[model samples]
Target: GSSGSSGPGRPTMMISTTAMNTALLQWHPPKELPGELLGYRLQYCRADEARPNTIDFGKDDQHFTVTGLHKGTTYIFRLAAKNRAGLGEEFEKEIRTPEDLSGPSSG
Candidate 1:
């Protein structure tokens, strides 16, 4: 017997500031899932980057801290859950890095 690939629900991404060039991404797992859950695949890209960065966080990873990003720049991110069947539906989010506020003031 073969089971068709059933995609997971879309993820919800929320951003929390940690530093000028860093952000903490928080998300919730998919709902109404089918089959044994394998893990999550996280992908992100900057405007000028040639390729997107990928991270395969084993099952049970729902949060990740993104670092080394350019300040005041926007980046796109995608999150997808994987199962024994295959990759599931993907969720996307766009985030803008906070401006650099740690620079010395010129009073």
Candidate 2:
């Protein structure tokens, strides 16, 4: 149920690697919930890349998957929760994609 208060104070971005170039991001509500949950905003960028991409999701949507990333690249992700009051503090995390590997050559 919605708290019907101000926006959440801060968010924590948690990411998991499911594949070489893929990752899953998720977050939980802040300990000091301020307002009723409205929705979520997420963004990410490569460590070496300047441009960033963003996605907005519904209140119940707490997770997202990122794909098509370059192998062996490092990335940073940011997430924030919004409520009726306003947007919360942005949370951030850094992740390194797993390097691509190949099978051993046949003798």
Candidate 3:
């Protein structure tokens, strides 16, 4: 999840993923500058989960770091920004982590 100021004016906005985590997102916070922000919202879920299970990405907070994920599992993420003026649509991307093998190595 992303965390930032809700105040007016867009400040060189950008979203980045950490390493190999499949997390796609889209965001757009009002076109015009110097606006009042009511709040932020998101729609997302696990890549494997049912499509109907997509829920609001704003549970903990905007500035959030997801943990306790499977070492080998893949994650897809997306984000969007909105203000009183209007919605700025969204941006999408994906991320994945390397898998671990406990079995004996082969020559």
Give the alpha carbon lDDT tens digit for every residue of 5-84 in model 2: 44577776689988668898778866555657888788889787777777887888878877887888888898887877
The global Cα lDDT (0 to 1) of model 1 is: 0.78
Q: RMSD to native for every prediction?
A: 3.0, 4.6, 8.6
**Model 2 spans with C-alpha error above 4 angstroms:** 1-7
CA lDDT of each prediction against the hidden true structure: 0.78, 0.78, 0.46
Query: What is candidate 2's CA lDDT for residue 41?
Result: 83
List candidate 1 segments past 4 Å from native. 1-3, 101-107
Candidate 1 lands at a TM-score of: 0.80
Tell me the lDDT of candidate 3: 0.46
Model 3 per-residue lDDT tens digits across residues 1-107 = 24544434332223444544432233444444346545454544557865522334431244444444455655555555545554444545455555655798779
Per-residue lDDT, model 3, residue 41, is 48
**Least accurate stretch of 10 residues (summed lDDT) in model 1?**
1-10
- How far residue 47's Cα lies from its native spot in candidate 3, in Å, is 2.4
